[PDB]
Write a structure and sequence with these properties.
Number of helices: 0
Largest sheet: 2 strands, antiparallel
Helix content: under 10%
Subcellular location: Secreted
Number of strands: 4
Strand order of the largest sheet: 1-2
Subunit structure: Interacts with LRP5 and LRP6.
Protein name: Dickkopf-related protein 4
Organism: Homo sapiens
Strand content: 5-15%
Structural class: mainly beta
Shape: elongated
Distance between the termini: 116 Å
Radius of gyration: 30 Å
Family: Belongs to the dickkopf family.
Length: about 100
């Protein structure tokens, strides 16, 4: 007359964690391919990638893989100053 038993012990409750008085400390806080712009007139926040048409102030301000020229984003293939001169290869030959 002994009914089968297992344990009967259902009890779970422990979830918490949230404290931040800011938007972001660095770009790493953002999604992935985004930089955390921090204006002097405005507050810091997560910005979106900047295109070749988008304006910039620094090299890091623009997305990874581009340069900031004339306050505007530009491809690495475009931004190329002081190229190599070179000429040709010297080689003699005779009998």
């Amino acid at each position: 007359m002994l009914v089968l038993d297992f344990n009967n012990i259902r009890s779970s409750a422990d979830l918490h964690g949230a404290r931040k008085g800011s938007q972001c400390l660095s770009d790493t806080d953002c999604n992935t391919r985004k930089f955390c712009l921090q204006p002097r007139d405005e507050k810091p926040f997560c910005a979106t990638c900047r295109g070749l048409r988008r304006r910039c102030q620094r090299d890091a301000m623009c997305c990874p893989g581009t340069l900031c020229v004339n306050d505007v984003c530009t491809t690495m293939e475009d931004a190329t100053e002081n190229l190599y001169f070179q000429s040709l290869e010297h080689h003699h030959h005779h009998h």
